[PDB]
C-alpha cells in the first residue's frame, strides 16, 4: 500500500523533471554552433615515449607543473616521469600490484593509488630520507578503488566499485563524507576547477553531481545506454563529458541539467576508456578500445583527428594544465606524449 | 645537458636496471584466476593444494600463482578486465546442489561469453562429487525436477566411468558436465577450450590436473602461431 503509492510518486517526479528539462530545451547546441568554422584537421605527433612499465598501464595523472606525471601499471610499480627528458624521477613499489587508479597532488608532494585491494595509499614524495614512503592507507571502501583525486594535501575524493564515493581526511585517516546514490559500480570521478563540486560516472549509465561540503547529490544525468567508464569536467566548470561502453561520448550541462551533444561515429563500436578536454575546451579527446584516440570537436561534434600510436587498449589519457601536450597510457605498457606542430 | 641533468639521467638508468630485475622474476610464473560461489568450495581446493587472496604452488619446477578475489560484490563485469592476461580461469561449482546449478550455468555463461575473456581457457571444476553421489543414491531430490532434459538423457557409450561407480551416478554426473560443455562449444569459435573435471574435498590431484590442463592451453597457443592448428 504505502510502498506502491510511494514508487508511483517517484515516477510522477521523474516525469516532472523530464518535462522541466524539455521545457528549457528550446534549442540545440548543434544549431548554435553550426555557423562557427570547424577546427580543421588536428595533427599530433608522438614527441616522447615513456618506456619501463612491464605490464598494462591503467592510469596516469599530470602534475600541476605540466612537466611531471605519475603512471600506474599492474607490474606493481608507480613511476613518476620527467616528461621533458623521459627520465624516471621515482619508482614506487606497490604493496598490491592490482592498481586501477593514480592521482598526483596539485602541490606535488603526494601521490595516491589503489585498486582491487580496496585501499587508497598516499605516498610522500618529499622526505628527508630521499625515498618515497607510504604515509597513509585509506581503508573503508568495500569495493575496488576506481578513481581518486586530491583536493589538497589533506583531502582526497575516491570512487569505488561498492557504488559509493567518499571524501577523506588524510591526516586522520577517516572518511568525513560518504556519497551514496549510485546503484552500480562508480568507475570514475572528475573535480570541478573550484573543487566545490565533482561529477562521478557509474555502471548504472548515470552521472551524478555531488556537493563536496554538503555531501549530497545535486543533479543526476542520464542518457547513456551502458556503463560509464570516464568523465571529465569542462574547463569552466559549467559542463562535463562522459564516456561509456556504447561507443558514445555525451556532453552534459550542469545548469541546463541535461545532455547537450553526443559524440559517436558509425565506425566506432568499441567502448571508451578515458576522456579529457583541451585547455580552451574546444577539443574533446577520448581513448577507445580499438587502440586509437579520437580527437573530437566539442562544439560541433566532428572528429577532428586520430591519435594512433598504441598496439593495445588505450586505458587512460590526460592533458597538461597549460594545455601544451596530451599523454596517453595503454595496455601495451607504453606512455606517449602528443602535441601538434606549426 | 648540464652536470645535474647527467646525474639525473644516471639515476633514471639505475631505476630501469632495478625495474628489469624485479620484472624478470614475474615472467616465469603462470597466473591463474579462481572463480566460484560461496558454496562452490573453491577455498577447499586451494587449501588442499597449498581484497585479493593469492596462493603459490609448484608442480614439477613450474610456478603457478592463483588469485582469488573475495573482497568484491557479485557484479564482476568491470574488474574482470584486470585478469585479461591470465593463462586459465579455475571455475569451481558445486554439483550436489541442483537448486543453484542453473545459477552456476548462468554465471559460467557470462564468464565464457565475456568480451575481455575471449582467449582465456577455463579449467572447470565440479567440486563435491562424493556428496553428489550420496544425494543421487538417496533419491530424495531428482535432477528431472530442476532439469527436464535429464529424464530423456542417456549415458553415451564413449563414456569411461571410474571403477566401482553405479550407472545411476554416471548418467547424472555426465549430464551436469554436458550442460557446461554445451555452453563452451556454443561460442568462442575454437579460440579457447573448457577443461571440465570432477573432484571432491579429499582429492589431492587438483594441482596436477591444473598442470596438465595448463600445458594444453600453452601448447595450443604455440600451435596457433605456427599455423599447425
Amino acid at each position: 500500500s504505502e510502498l506502491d503509492q510511494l514508487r508511483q510518486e517517484a515516477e510522477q517526479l521523474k516525469n516532472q523533471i523530464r518535462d522541466a528539462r524539455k521545457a528549457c530545451a528550446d534549442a540545440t547546441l548543434s544549431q548554435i554552433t553550426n555557423n562557427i568554422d570547424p577546427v580543421g584537421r588536428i595533427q599530433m605527433r608522438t614527441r616522447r615515449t615513456l618506456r619501463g612499465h612491464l605490464a598494462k598501464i591503467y592510469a596516469m595523472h599530470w602534475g600541476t607543473d605540466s612537466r611531471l606525471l605519475v603512471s600506474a601499471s599492474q607490474d606493481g610499480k608507480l613511476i613518476i616521469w620527467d616528461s621533458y627528458t623521459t627520465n624516471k624521477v621515482h619508482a614506487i613499489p606497490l604493496r598490491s600490484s592490482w592498481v586501477m587508479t593514480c592521482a598526483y597532488a596539485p602541490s606535488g608532494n603526494y601521490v595516491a593509488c589503489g585498486g582491487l585491494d580496496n585501499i587508497c595509499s598516499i605516498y610522500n614524495l618529499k622526505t628527508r630520507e630521499g625515498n618515497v614512503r607510504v604515509s597513509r592507507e585509506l581503508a573503508g571502501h568495500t569495493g575496488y578503488l576506481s578513481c581518486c583525486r586530491f583536493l589538497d594535501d589533506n583531502q582526497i575524493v575516491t570512487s569505488s566499485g561498492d557504488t559509493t564515493c567518499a571524501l577523506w581526511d588524510i591526516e586522520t585517516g577517516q572518511q568525513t563524507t560518504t556519497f551514496t546514490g549510485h546503484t552500480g559500480d562508480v568507475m570514475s570521478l572528475s573535480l570541478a576547477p573550484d573543487t566545490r563540486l565533482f561529477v562521478s560516472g557509474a555502471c548504472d549509465a548515470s552521472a551524478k553531481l555531488w556537493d563536496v561540503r554538503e555531501g549530497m547529490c545535486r543533479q543526476t544525468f542520464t542518457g547513456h545506454e551502458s556503463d560509464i567508464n570516464a568523465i571529465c569536467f569542462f574547463p569552466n566548470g559549467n559542463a562535463f563529458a562522459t564516456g561509456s561502453d556504447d561507443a558514445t561520448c555525451r556532453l552534459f550541462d550542469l545548469r541546463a541539467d541535461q545532455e547537450l551533444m553526443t559524440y559517436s561515429h558509425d565506425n566506432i563500436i568499441c567502448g571508451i576508456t578515458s576522456v579529457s578536454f583541451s585547455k580552451s575546451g574546444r577539443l574533446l579527446l577520448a581513448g577507445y578500445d580499438d587502440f586509437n584516440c579520437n580527437v573530437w570537436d566539442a562544439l560541433k561534434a566532428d572528429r577532428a583527428g586520430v591519435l594512433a600510436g598504441h598496439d593495445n587498449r588505450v586505458s587512460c589519457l590526460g592533458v597538461t594544465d597549460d594545455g601544451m601536450a596530451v599523454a596517453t597510457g595503454s595496455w601495451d605498457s607504453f606512455l606517449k606524449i602528443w602535441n601538434g606542430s606549426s | 645537458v648540464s652536470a645535474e641533468d647527467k646525474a639525473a639521467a644516471e639515476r633514471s638508468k639505475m631505476i630501469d636496471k632495478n625495474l628489469r630485475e624485479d620484472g624478470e622474476k614475474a615472467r616465469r610464473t603462470l597466473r591463474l584466476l579462481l572463480l566460484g560461489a560461496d558454496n562452490s568450495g573453491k577455498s577447499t581446493i586451494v587449501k588442499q593444494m597449498r581484497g585479493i587472496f593469492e596462493t603459490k604452488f609448484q608442480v614439477d619446477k613450474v610456478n603457478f600463482h592463483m588469485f582469488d578475489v573475495g573482497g568484491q560484490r557479485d557484479e564482476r563485469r568491470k574488474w574482470i578486465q584486470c585478469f585479461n592476461d591470465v593463462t586459465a580461469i579455475i571455475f569451481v561449482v558445486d554439483s550436489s546442489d541442483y537448486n543453484r546449478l542453473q545459477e552456476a550455468l548462468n554465471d559460467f555463461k557470462s564468464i565464457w561469453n565475456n568480451r575481455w575473456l575471449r582467449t582465456i581457457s577455463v579449467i572447470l571444476f565440479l567440486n563435491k562429487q562424493d556428496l553428489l553421489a550420496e544425494k543421487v543414491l538417496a533419491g530424495k531430490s531428482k535432477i528431472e525436477d530442476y532439469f527436464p532434459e535429464f529424464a530423456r538423457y542417456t549415458t553415451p557409450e564413449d563414456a569411461t566411468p571410474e571403477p566401482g561407480e553405479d550407472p545411476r551416478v554416471t548418467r547424472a554426473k555426465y549430464f551436469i558436465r554436458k550442460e557446461f560443455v554445451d555452453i563452451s562449444t556454443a561460442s568462442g569459435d575454437g579460440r579457447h577450450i573448457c577443461y571440465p573435471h570432477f573432484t571432491c574435498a579429499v582429492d589431492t590431484e587438483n594441482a596436477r590436473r591444473i598442470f596438465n590442463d595448463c600445458k594444453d592451453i600453452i601448447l595450443q597457443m604455440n600451435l596457433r602461431e605456427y599455423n599447425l592448428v
Partner: single-chain antibody
Amino acid sequence: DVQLVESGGGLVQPGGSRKLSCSASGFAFSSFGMHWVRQAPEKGLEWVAYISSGSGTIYYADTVKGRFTISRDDPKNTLFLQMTSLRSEDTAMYYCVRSIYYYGSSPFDFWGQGTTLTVSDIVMTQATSSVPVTPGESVSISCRSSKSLLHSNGNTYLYWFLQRPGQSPQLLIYRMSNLASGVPDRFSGSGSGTAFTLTISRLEAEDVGVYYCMQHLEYPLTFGAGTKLEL
C-alpha cells in the same frame, strides 16, 4: 634524524697516507651521490671529489686528482676517501656532503660535522669580504661568475651556503631561486646571467656567519671566497 659523521682525521707526516670515513645514518645512503669538500683553516670551501649513486661516476679536483681515491660501501652506509702523498696544502677540515639529483631535488642539502686533517674552471668572485650588519636591517650579498650559469634548459646552477661559526655549512638557496627545506622565508635568492644577489630581510643573530656561493653548471665545482657577516 639525518646524520653524517666523519672520522679518521689527524696529524700525519708529509708524503703519508690517511683513510677518511663517512658513516651515514637516518637516510637511504645508496640513493644519494656523495661529495667531499674541504676547507683550509681561515680559508674558503674547496671541492675535492664526487661519487654518484651506484658508484658509476667519479670526479676529482685537479689539485687532488691522481692522489685521492673516493669510494663507498653501500651495505655499511660508509663513504671513504683514500688519500696518498699528502702535502702541507692538504691541511683542512674535510666535510662529507650528500647530494641527490632529480628534477626538483636539492643537492648539497646536508653536510657532515667534518674531520680535521693536519699535515706537518669557473671563477666565483665575492669581492666584499665582510659586511657590518645590524639586526632587523636588509642585507644584500653579491656573487659573480666568469661564465654564465644560466643553462639552455632554464636552470641557473647557483647555490648559496651559510657556515655559522663552529658549525658546518648549510644550504640556503639552490639553483639561484629555490629555498631549501628548513630555511626561513626571509632569505631570498635573486640573479641573472653572471650576477647574483642574496637578500636577507630582517637579519637576526642566527644569520651571522660566512656565506658562500657555489656553481653547479659543470665540474669541478668551485666556491666563492665568501662574505662574512659581523655585528
